[PDB]
Design a protein around this ligand. Structure first.
Ligand SMILES: Nc1ncnc2c1ncn2[C@@H]1O[C@H](CSCC[C@H](N)C(=O)O)[C@@H](O)[C@H]1O
Ligand SMILES: Nc1ncnc2c1ncn2[C@@H]1O[C@H](CSCC[C@H](N)C(=O)O)[C@@H](O)[C@H]1O
Lengths: 383, 369
């Protein structure tokens, strides 16, 4: 069947946080539907495709968001049924707290059209970067604020907590001026029950324009009841709640994992630098210790290991691999006939020519780097 | 004070998943430090800046990663101390399950230099897109697999669970050939204990090359004890465990405040099919017949010169620096803006620039969730 739907994101900050593939698919699209919240990004989109319709006009005062979301999705699928290659655009990540994207893709799939979502940079990604925290340490809980209340979602006082849509608690509608967030007190009551009146809450707004600074204002739970503070929390506000304390290691698991043998007890409180700047009364960890200093001393005599594989490729091969990532029409051709496409690319080496015809990951990477005398695998664990 | 450190990401799929701002900062850098795991992306970066060093060479067989990570961070901050503007590059999101970026920035921050991280597209972002799930519904738990076991982190059977680094449970070092993931069974035991033997677990590997398909294989917890299946789990493997059931509403809270949504989670066990066009949907679709923009709706109405300059600030890191360094001189230096546009750039306030670019009727909200 002719016709496809691809949904892409623009990221949070104006223009700069759009990915290269999102841009290339927008330019190649036959018609574009977008929902963005900054004018420079909107104007930028209109420079890349002449046949765009702004989905934001389907919100309205006192109109259920469900009705808006249903309308948005059908407009996209209508152009798919006419056999056209359609691109939908939502700011941030288009599948993160976005109802209409999943709806439209699922309909297109069930009806038999090609359908794919390309990921983007979400508001939580911005949060990790600007607050300088990692979801790995000590885990991350992510909830919708109203759902968090209505279905009593468990807190974990030892992990990160991220809450979206704190500016429209219990509110199912839209209003152009703003929300009367008069049920905000119900969230605050729950956070006090779970965390205590003096536990920190960080009010986070990622910068939308390139020259702006983010807001990273630290409050207590109790401070959130004061009227002048509550009204600063709006439609682009997210909360970050840091852990209350550190969870103890399970002795039986350390033994089963063989990190310690039969009779040994782990070094409690061994903390990895750096410490969470937001956790209350978290102590200072020293960036340089004897163990750190000895690792640094080896930097003097360090040379590349034997089995380290430096990149060794060609202009033709780099160019074609770049082209596949940035040229959707070239990618479709290669996927149509791996061999035929590879035969038309000039100046590849024989090993390059065989790797491209196969297209397998193992063959091409061996083709593009130098092999130390010893099939080659993939390991990127920096966490 | 002179010297800065900017850390950026490349996303997961080669090249295409890099952000525009990541590219411009790489090109502008005095020195570039990169850590990527695909060859096309490495080659692409090396064309865009001519002073790069590959950090990957500080791993080694049998070497603790903590030693490598301290080395990676020290290499960068030493050049910052010389007063240089340096950018570090890590694949995916440069702050998601990556240790040395925070360390290097924290050292730089302690010594008084400007230090910033630019976000990228993580493997979890790819998971949501390829598995067609939304973190909003019904919430999402994300853990490091070894931490999950050692600290006995709580599960929630009604929310999404995502586990990173399942291919090296309990392994603190590195090897070029591969991990012998022989403690994987302790993790499988925990999953059986929490969800039961027949609950689904989807093994996910996002495509790294643009022509590749993702791995999206659905297995029961019990099949993960077969040898031939366990060896499939490697250094780029992530697990998604879907919810077992739907949690009841709090009857107290619903009234204190003033049936499933299509579509259903395809991966949940024993969850019924939903109708996409219920009658309430069809009435909203009926509203298609005659619709116009609302009265307070603000259509975009800007100029080429204005759109161009705001774009330049997003795509030219030095121009941004010049603007931030001196609002007054830059705004007046730009030709062809109207009187309210140049004044709006001199101000820099969010409200002013927006008024200059949008038609306001006679008189920031983006909730699609
Ligand atoms: N600039 C910003 N800074 C912090 N949070 C933001 C934000 N913009 C939107 N959000 C959050 O996202 C919610 C809207 S739902 C849209 C989210 C978007 N798809 C994304 O990828 O992030 C808001 O209620 C708010 O909680
Ligand atoms: N292609 C892929 N598909 C699924 N998970 C992946 C992946 N590549 C890396 N990962 C996950 O990331 C871990 C490495 S730690 C690096 C994570 C990276 N910074 C990011 O933003 O995603 C791996 O153990 C694996 O769980």
């Amino acid at each position: 069947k002719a016709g496809s739907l691809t949904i892409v994101g623009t990221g949070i900050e104006s223009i700069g946080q759009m990915t290269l593939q999102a841009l290339s698919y927008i330019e190649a699209a036959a018609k574009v539907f977008y929902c963005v919240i900054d004018p420079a990004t909107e104007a930028f989109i209109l420079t890349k495709n002449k046949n765009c319709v702004d989905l934001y006009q389907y919100y309205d005062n006192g109109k259920s968001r469900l009705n808006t979301y249903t309308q948005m999705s059908e407009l996209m699928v209508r152009e798919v049924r006419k056999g056209l290659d359609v691109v939908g655009v939502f700011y941030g990540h288009p599948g993160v707290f976005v109802n209409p994207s999943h709806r439209a893709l699922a309909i297109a799939k069930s009806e038999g059209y090609r359908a794919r979502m390309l990921p983007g940079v979400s508001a939580e990604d911005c949060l990790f970067a600007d607050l300088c925290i990692d979801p790995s340490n000590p885990g991350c809980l992510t909830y919708e604020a109203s759902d968090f209340l209505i279905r009593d979602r468990p807190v974990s006082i030892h992990s990160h907590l991220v809450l979206f849509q704190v500016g429209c608690v219990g509110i199912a509608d839209f209003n152009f001026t703003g929300f009367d967030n008069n049920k905000f007190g119900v969230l605050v009551d729950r956070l006090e029950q779970e965390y205590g009146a003096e536990h920190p809450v960080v009010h986070y707004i990622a910068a939308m324009m390139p020259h702006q600074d983010p807001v990273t204002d630290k409050y207590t739970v109790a401070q959130l009841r004061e009227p002048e503070i509550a009204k600063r929390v709006g439609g682009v506000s997210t909360f970050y709640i840091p852990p209350k304390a550190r969870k103890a290691s399970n002795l039986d698991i350390i033994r089963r994992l063989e990190l310690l043998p039969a009779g040994q007890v782990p070094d409690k409180k061994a903390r990895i630098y750096p410490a969470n700047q937001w956790e209350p009364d978290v102590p200072e960890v020293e960036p340089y210790r004897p163990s750190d200093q000895a690792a640094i001393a080896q930097l003097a005599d360090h040379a590349p290991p034997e089995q380290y594989q430096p990149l060794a490729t060609s202009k033709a091969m780099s160019d074609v691999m770049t082209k596949l990532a940035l040229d959707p029409k070239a990618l479709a051709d290669y996927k149509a006939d791996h061999r035929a496409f590879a035969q038309s690319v000039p100046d590849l080496t024989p090993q390059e020519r065989a790797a491209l015809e196969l297209g397998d990951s193992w063959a091409i990477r061996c083709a593009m780097k130098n092999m130390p005398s010893s099939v080659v695998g993939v390991i990127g664990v920096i966490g």
